[PDB]
Design a protein around this ligand. Structure first.
Ligand SMILES: CC(=O)Cc1c2c(=O)[nH]c(=O)nc-2n(C[C@H](O)[C@H](O)[C@H](O)COP(=O)(O)O[C@@H](C)C(=O)N[C@@H](CCC(=O)N[C@@H](CCC(=O)O)C(=O)O)C(=O)O)c2cc(O)ccc12
Ligand SMILES: CC(=O)Cc1c2c(=O)[nH]c(=O)nc-2n(C[C@H](O)[C@H](O)[C@H](O)COP(=O)(O)O[C@@H](C)C(=O)N[C@@H](CCC(=O)N[C@@H](CCC(=O)O)C(=O)O)C(=O)O)c2cc(O)ccc12
Ligand SMILES: [Cl-]
Ligand SMILES: [Cl-]
Ligand SMILES: [Cl-]
Ligand SMILES: [Cl-]
Ligand SMILES: [K+]
Ligand SMILES: [K+]
Lengths: 330, 330
């Protein structure tokens, strides 16, 4: 599996047009792909945004030339109807052949609760996510209308009239052992986040491959993608503090509990310890340290990086990759 | 009220990239705005598409320079969550200041049923549409999180972190007398379709203005927009037959009954009489006839045209407007 280096352009940390400009610059510097978060409420309250990802993606695909672009990730089970998610990405891939993907996952209360008032348990959301993926695949792959009455979703003589030449690649998010195994069973590739290399090497990747083998798949053709935030600045302290915005992602309960007010998510983010940030995220003072940070995750099994630029000087955070990319391979 | 002439680029009759190219050409020829249908299933089965409109709009706004672009129309009550519709258009308007609008309406079974299995009555859907508009406005206009428990929709400490400089203009569709009055009460402007000038002059516009006055609004600042399909070709018979794809829109029951299979919608479309098509749509052999067709609708009260090009020669159907636009005024 070849190493791909992608850029995560946040619609929570930056205004959407600013994120679009970052994506264009990332492509020029040499990133292979661009990834974007799909949120309704942000992980932090102060100076935050939460732009709609699908509308932004149409603009980004049109503004760029060749990079692959995918969400990271799109929860297809509550505020979004899975058939509509299937239609959206099939449409974009027909418009921009070979440049479009989608990633899915069980959700976060901060996006789903504010607009539905509901929050089911983790096993129920995982179950809903598997059924959503089934719905998406039926629509992407069927040559005739399909009727389906699942436990959560319904299709009634549904057909996708707009399909791409080849199927949209589907990344499935798994953070815990059960989620990772489900990703191997139902996704084309793994997507993960907020894990230290040890967890990846010993739990996440092994469980993902176990799920793939149980389903009769060759895990060797399945990418291991991961969202990791980085901050690079000559002043180490300034670089580490600049990652504060994303500290809440390192609090496991934020992915399970019914917490959806960004002000309270921010309180938790502000309680995260500096060593937790340095252990999970990439804090670097120069290109050499960034290369080594990436290499420790490569050694753990990651081969498609989705790197979220949370650097004090955003443009430098992108530019410095002219030195990083060739050294890590792509 | 000044007359504006817009172009309706269909994602049902054309592939999405083809519709994008038409939009770019329309802007160059002089159209003031571009409108796009928001469907899951198409009005006709043969050679049809149904691309997702929001993703397409991000691409079209990025590819064009100044035209105003809006959906025509987006049903915000079942397959789409109204808070998400509110987020999508607020995001696009923040990215493309002053160039984005949205139109809403009660829906069509062909879009909502295939992905939900449900189809409420007209009065219930109208009621849901009014509550959806309330949800959208609360989110667009509030400076603090809002909590709302309506009959159909829920907001729980919801806040739009990404807002444009000024509010998204909202077109409200009304076809029947009650819908037209609701449009005057709750929309910023009227959107309508499938009506002859007499109906417009005597029922639709009067009811819309009645609704606006009841709500305390000045109807004089509210546009009267309408989607009308046209076909222009030197051979009149060829021009009229080219409108077949859209004949189903002239069958009132298609907006009320639970009919969602495009093959059966097509059967009905194929039973529509030629005089019905000539009376409601614009069939012309040259620029002069197009100008007179537009003038008869202007006289009935329409001042923002959304013209759907269903001409045999699509490019000529756009180009000929270099001669039409200056004569009808914009
Ligand atoms: C920027 C960002 O938010 C990340 C991006 C997301 C986004 O933009 N939008 C969005 O909606 N979601 C995003 N996600 C997260 C994703 O939606 C979803 O939350 C995760 O895929 C969930 O992973 P999972 O299915 O593995 O479930 C988690 C919660 C898990 O841990 N499950 C385990 C079972 C529960 C458990 O952990 N409890 C244990 C105790 C643990 C303890 O002691 O603390 C117990 O029961 O014993 C399990 O085993 O599966 C993502 C996601 C990725 O990957 C990348 C970008 C975004
Ligand atoms: C290309 C296209 O489909 C048009 C575009 C639409 C789109 O792209 N997507 C979409 O989801 N919808 C589109 N619509 C239609 C819109 O969603 C919606 O169907 C209309 O706004 C509904 O109008 P309305 O609220 O006025 O309701 C109609 C059905 C109406 O007639 N209501 C009346 C009451 C019922 C009635 O007619 N029955 C009468 C008997 C009549 C008889 O004898 O036949 C009775 O009860 O006595 C009423 O009074 O309100 C649109 C819409 C527009 O405007 C533009 C583009 C699209
Ligand atoms: Cl910004
Ligand atoms: Cl970021
Ligand atoms: Cl086409
Ligand atoms: Cl058309
Ligand atoms: K393709
Ligand atoms: K604006």
């Amino acid at each position: 599996m070849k190493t791909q280096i992608g850029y995560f352009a946040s619609l929570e940390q930056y205004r959407p047009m600013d994120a679009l400009e970052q994506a264009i610059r990332a492509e020029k510097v040499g990133f292979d792909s661009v990834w974007v978060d799909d949120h309704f409420h942000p992980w932090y309250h102060d100076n935050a945004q939460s732009a709609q990802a699908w509308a932004w993606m149409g603009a980004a695909l049109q503004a760029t030339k060749k990079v692959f672009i995918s969400t990271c990730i799109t929860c297809p089970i509550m505020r979004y109807n899975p058939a509509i998610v299937a239609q959206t990405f099939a449409t974009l891939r027909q418009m921009y052949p070979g440049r479009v993907g989608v990633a899915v996952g069980a959700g976060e209360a901060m996006n789903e609760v504010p607009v539905t008032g509901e929050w089911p348990s983790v096993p129920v959301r995982q179950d809903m996510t598997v059924e959503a993926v089934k719905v998406m695949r039926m629509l992407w792959e069927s040559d005739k209308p399909v009727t389906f009455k699942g436990d959560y979703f319904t299709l009634d003589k549904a057909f996708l009239y707009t399909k791409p030449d080849d199927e949209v690649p589907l990344y499935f998010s798994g953070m815990g052992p059960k989620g990772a195994k489900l990703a191997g069973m139902y996704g084309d590739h793994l997507m993960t986040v907020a894990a230290a290399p040890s967890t990846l090497k010993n739990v996440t990747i092994p469980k993902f491959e176990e799920g793939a083998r149980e389903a009769g798949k060759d895990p060797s053709k399945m990418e291991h993608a991961m969202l990791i935030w980085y901050s690079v600045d000559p002043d180490y302290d300034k670089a580490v503090e600049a990652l504060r915005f994303w500290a809440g992602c390192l609090v496991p309960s934020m992915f399970k509990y019914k917490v959806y007010d960004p002000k309270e998510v921010q309180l938790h983010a502000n309680l995260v310890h500096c060593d937790t940030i340095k252990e999970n995220y990439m804090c670097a003072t120069d290109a050499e340290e960034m290369i080594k940070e990436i290499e420790r995750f490569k050694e753990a099994g990651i081969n498609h990086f989705c790197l979220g630029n949370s650097s004090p000087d955003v443009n430098f955070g992108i530019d410095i990759f002219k030195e990083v990319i060739p050294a890590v391979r792509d």
